[PDB]
Design a binder for this molecule. Structure first.
Ligand SMILES: *[C@@H]1O[C@H](CO)[C@@H](O[C@@H]2O[C@H](CO)[C@@H](O[C@@H]3O[C@H](CO)[C@@H](O)[C@H](O)[C@@H]3O)[C@H](O)[C@H]2NC(C)=O)[C@H](O)[C@H]1NC(C)=O
Lengths: 49, 49
């Protein structure tokens, strides 16, 4: 934010005035989420009778 | 009558958590010959899991 004002007067008256206002706002958000789960097996039952 | 058993159980669990937060605020004001105003704000947030 920025602001400037100026005032100067001299009677011979005379009047002069400055008034300024500046406002700026920025917001940024980001999210990345990952979830992975893996399972893999076997069961090789072999029987000889 | 022979038997032959084998069990090999394994369990692993790992968890990591990290959080970062940063905030900055600045303001300046000067009034004499001319009025002046300045404002500054900064915010940062970071989290990892
Ligand atoms: C940054 O971190 C915050 C804080 O951990 C995260 O906020 C979380 O947002 C979820 C979204 O709904 C909230 O609900 C939760 O949802 C999950 C499914 O994703 C569910 O399993 C939970 O039971 C719950 O309902 C959660 O409550 C909230 N955390 C807290 C502590 O309130 C945010 O999501 C993170 N940023 C990103 C981009 O993920």
């Amino acid at each position: 934010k920025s602001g400037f004002s100026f005032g100067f007067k001299i009677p011979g008256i005379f009047e002069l005035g400055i008034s300024s206002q500046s406002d700026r706002g920025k917001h940024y958000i980001r999210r990345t989420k990952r979830f992975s789960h893996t399972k893999s097996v076997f069961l090789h039952a072999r029987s000889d009778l | 009558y022979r038997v032959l058993f084998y069990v090999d159980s394994e369990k692993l669990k790992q968890n990591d958590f990290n959080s970062v937060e940063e905030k900055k605020c600045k303001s300046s004001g000067w009034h004499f010959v001319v009025k002046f105003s300045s404002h500054g704000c900064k915010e940062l947030e970071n989290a990892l899991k």
